[PDB]
Assembly symmetry: D2
Homo-oligomer: 344 residues x 4
Amino acid sequence: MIDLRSDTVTKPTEEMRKAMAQAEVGDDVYGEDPTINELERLAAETFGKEAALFVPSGTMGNQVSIMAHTQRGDEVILEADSHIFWAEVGAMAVLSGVMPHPVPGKNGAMDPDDVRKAIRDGNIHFPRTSLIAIENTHNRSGGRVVPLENIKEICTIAKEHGINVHIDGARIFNASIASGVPVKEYAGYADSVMFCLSKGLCAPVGSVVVGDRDFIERARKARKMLGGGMRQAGVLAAAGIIALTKMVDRLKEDHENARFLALKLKEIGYSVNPEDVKTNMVILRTDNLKVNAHGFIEALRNSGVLAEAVSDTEIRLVTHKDVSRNDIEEALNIFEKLFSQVQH
Amino acid sequence: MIDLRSDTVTKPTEEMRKAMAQAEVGDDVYGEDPTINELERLAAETFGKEAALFVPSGTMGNQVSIMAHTQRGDEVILEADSHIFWAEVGAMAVLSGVMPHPVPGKNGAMDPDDVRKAIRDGNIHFPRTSLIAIENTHNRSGGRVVPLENIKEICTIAKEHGINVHIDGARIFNASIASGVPVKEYAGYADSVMFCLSKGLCAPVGSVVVGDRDFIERARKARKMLGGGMRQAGVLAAAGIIALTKMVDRLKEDHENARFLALKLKEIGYSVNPEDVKTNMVILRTDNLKVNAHGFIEALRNSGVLAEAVSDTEIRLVTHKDVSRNDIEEALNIFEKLFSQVQ
Amino acid sequence: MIDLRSDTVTKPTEEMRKAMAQAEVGDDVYGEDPTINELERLAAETFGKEAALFVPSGTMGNQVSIMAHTQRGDEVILEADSHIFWAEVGAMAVLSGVMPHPVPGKNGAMDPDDVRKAIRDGNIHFPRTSLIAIENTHNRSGGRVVPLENIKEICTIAKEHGINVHIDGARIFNASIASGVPVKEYAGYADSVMFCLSKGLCAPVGSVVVGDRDFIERARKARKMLGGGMRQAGVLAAAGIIALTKMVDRLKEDHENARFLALKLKEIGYSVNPEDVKTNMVILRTDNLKVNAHGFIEALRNSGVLAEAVSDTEIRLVTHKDVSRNDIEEALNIFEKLFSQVQ
Amino acid sequence: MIDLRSDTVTKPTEEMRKAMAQAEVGDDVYGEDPTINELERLAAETFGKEAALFVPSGTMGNQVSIMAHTQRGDEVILEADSHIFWAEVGAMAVLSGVMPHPVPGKNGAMDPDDVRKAIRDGNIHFPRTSLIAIENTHNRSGGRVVPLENIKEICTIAKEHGINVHIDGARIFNASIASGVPVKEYAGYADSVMFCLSKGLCAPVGSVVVGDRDFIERARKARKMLGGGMRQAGVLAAAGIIALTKMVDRLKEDHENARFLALKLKEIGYSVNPEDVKTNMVILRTDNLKVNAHGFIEALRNSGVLAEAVSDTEIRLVTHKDVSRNDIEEALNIFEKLFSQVQ
Ligand SMILES: [Ca+2]
Ligand SMILES: [Ca+2]
Ligand SMILES: [Ca+2]
Ligand SMILES: [Ca+2]
């Protein structure tokens, strides 16, 4: 088995396992877990923010941010293919009572003039626009990197209208590794940033939200309500400190593996665009195959390669710490074998 | 003052005023208002449905329909410029806890394959898609008529998947007058239809939802929750019975006046597309004007013509019973005057 | 028939029917209905508040008040048998996402020390308490009057904790007639008051909320979201102006008729307590009867008297404009015949 | 320092820490974490239910159960002092749009006849009662045990009305230990039970919900929505398996320590009722003391004992694994020195 379904599947390193076992813990409901308290201090420091909040998932990170940013009946501008809108169970509507206002982007980049256009006038008929969300990297387009200049302009548009900005930075360090832009400088154009520890950085559980002391307080109370108020969570935060402080640099290996994997897949004859591979994700089209995305997933699964389809004709391949160059090469040999068996 | 902001501004006819003063009434919360009961019987019968529910507004018509069709956390597929998404205060999210899934359409017509692609798989990350809403006529695109075939194909898609279909037919009679499709035939492809009395049909207050007995029963309890459970509302249903039975045919005059207004406006030189005017609405673009939409509205208001912006660069003109052909002609002179100033 | 189920069954007076007939109307979504505007102005003036908002029901009046007073997650303290909790479809939880905090009272009066104890401290486990609701008269206890001292003390607790007060004054004018306390004085200890036009004051549709202009502005937008933004609603407001200014003082008849009814019912042998009858409601117990509430209601209905059970063993009788002293004396004869048959 | 604020403060045993280091993990979003999978299997088996779901907190455990049990606008009967009502941030209203219906109890036991009268009839005005919640042990009354006969009679009432039952069993194993009722038999009277790993059973994080397969599937989707869908959560589940399988019996020591603590505190002269100490909690009154609860807490803190106020005259001490019999006696001598200073 070679698991290219997601970078979520990453397993803890031996150093994470030791640190978790011997974590200094307390009751986080009293703010007394010291390893939680230090993870949040580090995260706030790293993003140049006042405060930070550990959460058991990126989904909860994003939804406590929406709650702390909005009142009932607000509208939240977000990209039409973004995670908050497609893969968070409609939570923004049920939990926050807010409307998404989807804006089609280009590989994650919403046209700033479209964002401006989507902001609501004050009129009794209209929800109040109170939040613009930006995802970086943008998952559904293939781990694409949103330009810093795009985020900068959207921040400006938001400040000109008294609207908050949230960065869905589930994979923001990947974006940073690919662009050279430090995450402090990304975060300077947002009121809040959620980032995952449990994807490429290899922690077993959870994410962090960074922002103002005011917002984080409101998000901490939203977390209690949603059920993310844990006890001796320092057992998880120990791994998160390691993930945050020791696992960023090596994301470059994931990017190089993903680039090598795409380059070779095109040489075999698969419909991939190696020029589109910016971070740790490859998109493969089934249009020159006699199967669709789902049938190809089954052939791959049967041959020892796990991937997932993202539409009827597209599959997403994701590299991560538990996929070595040797793994990529053994996967390429499987892809090569099946290719004659799957083409049109 | 010539009012082209909306057909909502229609005032009741003297016949309506007399019927309201004489209405036989009861407490609608016990279902004992006979004028309410007769309007709902007439509305169900007109639309081919088992049952109907009077509501104080079209917005409440849409929102009790959504509540009755959905559970918390469902997604509703709707057109990206439809009234439910654009101009109903985010009620579907606040009141029903449901996620809108906007689909950009063409003149209100969502591509049915785009509707199919929007329906969610069974996956834990994904809400359940339980409703598709369609708007006819489509307001924001200029009172455009959604082709019946589009509604047919989307009703087909929904049924394959067990999804309910709501038609926001706030102006469905304008659509019927222009398309020839009887409202009963549109309604056959829907689980529920809301339509307004208080717009082109000149009633002072209210809309009706038509549908199945069970759904209407659920929608009535949603009405009670949202605050639409009134008492002797037969006073309003008396005007509504007249609106439904006596004011439909003269909608062709609003359409003729709208067409005349648009052809003449184009001749003056405004950015209008008369070939797009099929009902009672005209969209005028300001790309060839000194002013934007909001500056033109102010200039028009100054000159005694009331209009409304639908975007930064588009104004909406609406005709109705209280705009006569002479009103249109007088408004065209005003529109003529201000053209040399604003070009 | 004689209808003692509720005072909602009141029919418009001839004066009202005339007023509705020639109401001067406009589109209330533009704030252009001159009769709505006058009704709101008179309502604000009558209660000593900056502004007012007409709504199609008292339920909508309470729920837009709650929405405008609160944010998601807040707690609302309210009497454990109040209408907002018992008879408003759980709307406060669905619409505003707010937690009721029920506090048992004596005939509507929550002990202020229990109110103060129900207020949440600043802790992450706890909702913020943002609203206290007081109902006057109190429906479920039988039209009981909350003493002005109770309102004052609760108002004082509220101001010292930063909490708003809403009076559910659906029947506030019945309370004012019984206690002699003018409605402005009650309303001076609240941030908002909802009062009904469609019960004892005999309008066919509607209630009004009064309060500060900012709150009213918020509640108007909640009204739009809930479906209460109507068009030429001056037709209803015309009746509501007569209800507000001219129908209050004759409420004393309804109280005299209620107590006459209650004294004669006890004399006959029914389990009523006429000393408890302060406004237009009488509660009759079925303890000494062969039937329960629902059984008694069926027998009464079969004999021409409509009443309403309020528990398994309690029934409610409500007097109103359409039940004269003559109507009462007849109903008492039916109650006499029935007593022998059902004791 | 001696921490008597709560049993939530328990730290992982050495064994737990070893298992955490070497837990086999997988991605739980894919159902692929074998240690999670085994914990859920063990939990379902211990309670005699079809399925189980690990969650990051008991708060999430209760709220996903409420979500899976209810539709919007439903009503939930629960005890007026229960955790879901007082200390879960109003989540049932925001997340589920449901109203609580508080029924006061005696030490967590709602009178079954009071649960009867709290159920709603079918009427358009009323929410639908869909859930009854019982808390065992009952926290705010001081860890009292709800009699199994109270649970069986309420289950009986629930089955008679189509109503689901949820047991908030945060401290259910404390109840089983003090009562001799196996948790499997408690669980037989409920559709679902939530119980905490992270209080007295000493795991660092998390709770478990058990119920039927379809319920748990619905609650797993609610978990995803609320943000409790974690990845390699087997690290947490490794300690949870130890908590569930090896930490239950020694809860007897916390009960012994609590009784010993309380008995000796009374000998010293504090206002404690040792007979009321049924599990691991001691309630102490400030009636015979200079200070209120908040004063006494601060004085105990400066002296090296952490405790919590549960009211303005009541304080709560909680025994747990990390309080030895030595810790207890060191705390007793601190309570001695303070007594004259507050008597
Ligand atoms: Ca991971
Ligand atoms: Ca009208
Ligand atoms: Ca009436
Ligand atoms: Ca613990």
